[PDB]
PDB file of all heavy atoms in Angstrom:
ATOM      1  N   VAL E  68      56.162 226.013 128.548  1.00  0.00           N
ATOM      2  CA  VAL E  68      56.466 225.234 127.349  1.00  0.00           C
ATOM      3  C   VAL E  68      57.988 225.348 127.185  1.00  0.00           C
ATOM      4  O   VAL E  68      58.512 226.432 127.193  1.00  0.00           O
ATOM      5  CB  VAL E  68      55.803 225.830 126.095  1.00  0.00           C
ATOM      6  CG1 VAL E  68      56.189 225.032 124.871  1.00  0.00           C
ATOM      7  CG2 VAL E  68      54.265 225.860 126.220  1.00  0.00           C
ATOM      8  N   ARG E  69      58.681 224.223 127.024  1.00  0.00           N
ATOM      9  CA  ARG E  69      60.127 224.228 126.930  1.00  0.00           C
ATOM     10  C   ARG E  69      60.477 223.509 125.631  1.00  0.00           C
ATOM     11  O   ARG E  69      60.095 222.360 125.431  1.00  0.00           O
ATOM     12  CB  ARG E  69      60.673 223.492 128.164  1.00  0.00           C
ATOM     13  CG  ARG E  69      62.076 223.809 128.533  1.00  0.00           C
ATOM     14  CD  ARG E  69      62.491 223.141 129.864  1.00  0.00           C
ATOM     15  NE  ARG E  69      61.823 223.792 131.005  1.00  0.00           N
ATOM     16  CZ  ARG E  69      62.245 223.731 132.273  1.00  0.00           C
ATOM     17  NH1 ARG E  69      63.357 223.066 132.579  1.00  0.00           N
ATOM     18  NH2 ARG E  69      61.569 224.355 133.240  1.00  0.00           N
ATOM     19  N   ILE E  70      61.148 224.189 124.712  1.00  0.00           N
ATOM     20  CA  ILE E  70      61.509 223.595 123.411  1.00  0.00           C
ATOM     21  C   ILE E  70      63.026 223.432 123.397  1.00  0.00           C
ATOM     22  O   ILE E  70      63.775 224.416 123.414  1.00  0.00           O
ATOM     23  CB  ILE E  70      61.028 224.446 122.219  1.00  0.00           C
ATOM     24  CG1 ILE E  70      59.506 224.664 122.321  1.00  0.00           C
ATOM     25  CG2 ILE E  70      61.375 223.774 120.881  1.00  0.00           C
ATOM     26  CD1 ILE E  70      58.838 225.377 121.137  1.00  0.00           C
ATOM     27  N   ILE E  71      63.468 222.183 123.411  1.00  0.00           N
ATOM     28  CA  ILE E  71      64.909 221.882 123.401  1.00  0.00           C
ATOM     29  C   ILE E  71      65.334 221.607 121.972  1.00  0.00           C
ATOM     30  O   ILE E  71      64.711 220.812 121.274  1.00  0.00           O
ATOM     31  CB  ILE E  71      65.184 220.698 124.333  1.00  0.00           C
ATOM     32  CG1 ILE E  71      64.704 221.093 125.736  1.00  0.00           C
ATOM     33  CG2 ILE E  71      66.659 220.344 124.329  1.00  0.00           C
ATOM     34  CD1 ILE E  71      64.921 220.038 126.821  1.00  0.00           C
ATOM     35  N   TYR E  72      66.370 222.299 121.491  1.00  0.00           N
ATOM     36  CA  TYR E  72      66.717 222.147 120.085  1.00  0.00           C
ATOM     37  C   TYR E  72      68.234 222.010 119.874  1.00  0.00           C
ATOM     38  O   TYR E  72      69.005 222.407 120.754  1.00  0.00           O
ATOM     39  CB  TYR E  72      66.193 223.324 119.267  1.00  0.00           C
ATOM     40  CG  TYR E  72      66.836 224.645 119.642  1.00  0.00           C
ATOM     41  CD1 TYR E  72      68.042 225.052 119.045  1.00  0.00           C
ATOM     42  CD2 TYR E  72      66.246 225.498 120.615  1.00  0.00           C
ATOM     43  CE1 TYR E  72      68.643 226.271 119.383  1.00  0.00           C
ATOM     44  CE2 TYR E  72      66.854 226.711 120.948  1.00  0.00           C
ATOM     45  CZ  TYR E  72      68.045 227.064 120.329  1.00  0.00           C
ATOM     46  OH  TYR E  72      68.612 228.244 120.665  1.00  0.00           O
ATOM     47  N   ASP E  73      68.612 221.444 118.723  1.00  0.00           N
ATOM     48  CA  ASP E  73      70.011 221.391 118.242  1.00  0.00           C
ATOM     49  C   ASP E  73      70.100 221.819 116.817  1.00  0.00           C
ATOM     50  O   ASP E  73      69.232 221.537 116.033  1.00  0.00           O
ATOM     51  CB  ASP E  73      70.621 219.968 118.388  1.00  0.00           C
ATOM     52  CG  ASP E  73      69.862 218.887 117.593  1.00  0.00           C
ATOM     53  OD1 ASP E  73      70.144 218.676 116.378  1.00  0.00           O
ATOM     54  OD2 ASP E  73      68.975 218.230 118.204  1.00  0.00           O
ATOM     55  N   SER E  74      71.189 222.477 116.430  1.00  0.00           N
ATOM     56  CA  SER E  74      71.344 222.843 115.032  1.00  0.00           C
ATOM     57  C   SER E  74      72.817 222.843 114.711  1.00  0.00           C
ATOM     58  O   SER E  74      73.637 222.696 115.625  1.00  0.00           O
ATOM     59  CB  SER E  74      70.801 224.240 114.748  1.00  0.00           C
ATOM     60  OG  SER E  74      71.710 225.220 115.208  1.00  0.00           O
ATOM     61  N   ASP E  75      73.126 223.035 113.428  1.00  0.00           N
ATOM     62  CA  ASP E  75      74.519 223.119 112.956  1.00  0.00           C
ATOM     63  C   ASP E  75      75.191 224.432 113.388  1.00  0.00           C
ATOM     64  O   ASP E  75      76.386 224.638 113.134  1.00  0.00           O
ATOM     65  CB  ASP E  75      74.647 222.883 111.437  1.00  0.00           C
ATOM     66  CG  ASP E  75      73.631 223.675 110.595  1.00  0.00           C
ATOM     67  OD1 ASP E  75      72.783 224.373 111.169  1.00  0.00           O
ATOM     68  OD2 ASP E  75      73.686 223.564 109.338  1.00  0.00           O
ATOM     69  N   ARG E  76      74.424 225.315 114.031  1.00  0.00           N
ATOM     70  CA  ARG E  76      74.948 226.627 114.443  1.00  0.00           C
ATOM     71  C   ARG E  76      74.840 226.802 115.958  1.00  0.00           C
ATOM     72  O   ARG E  76      74.967 227.906 116.462  1.00  0.00           O
ATOM     73  CB  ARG E  76      74.198 227.770 113.743  1.00  0.00           C
ATOM     74  CG  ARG E  76      74.085 227.689 112.232  1.00  0.00           C
ATOM     75  CD  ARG E  76      75.404 227.715 111.524  1.00  0.00           C
ATOM     76  NE  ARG E  76      75.227 227.912 110.079  1.00  0.00           N
ATOM     77  CZ  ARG E  76      76.199 228.274 109.241  1.00  0.00           C
ATOM     78  NH1 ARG E  76      77.428 228.497 109.702  1.00  0.00           N
ATOM     79  NH2 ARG E  76      75.944 228.400 107.947  1.00  0.00           N
ATOM     80  N   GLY E  77      74.549 225.729 116.684  1.00  0.00           N
ATOM     81  CA  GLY E  77      74.484 225.814 118.143  1.00  0.00           C
ATOM     82  C   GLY E  77      73.199 225.182 118.661  1.00  0.00           C
ATOM     83  O   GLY E  77      72.271 224.965 117.893  1.00  0.00           O
TER      84      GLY E  77
END
Side-chain angles (χ1 to χ4, degrees):
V68 178
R69 202 174 288 201
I70 304 186
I71 301 181
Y72 65 87
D73 60 86
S74 77
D75 47 357
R76 308 298 192 164

